[PDB]
Design a protein around this ligand. Sequence first.
Ligand code: GSH
Length: 112
Amino acid sequence: SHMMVSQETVAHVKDLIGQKEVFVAAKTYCPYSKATLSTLFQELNVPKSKALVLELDEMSNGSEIQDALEEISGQKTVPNVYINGKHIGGNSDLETLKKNGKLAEILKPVFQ
Ligand SMILES: *SC[C@H](NC(=O)CC[C@@H](N)C(=O)O)C(=O)NCC(=O)O
């Protein structure tokens, strides 16, 4: 579908992003996504209750969600991470924020 992704799907994806503090469009096969999930949930202990992780490969409309996410930011890759309104981007971006110390600042409201 790609750029044919509907307003409705895109609106729905925005709703999903807003549903939990931590949003990750993931792919179980994607190493960077496994890294991101590991970082958020294992290393940084983000409670799963505070996250929505969409395994796009496990979703029948996972492709359309990816397309929606691409419309929303331009990002074509997984993982696609949002935290508290912030489009973090992919794993390498998460990594930069982790090292920056900014990820912790971003996550502060999450643990609260
Ligand atoms: S692993 C799947 C792949 N993801 C990336 O190349 C991520 C980019 C990287 N800098 C990061 O997130 O740190 C990908 O999304 N390939 C295309 C697809 O259709 O999924």
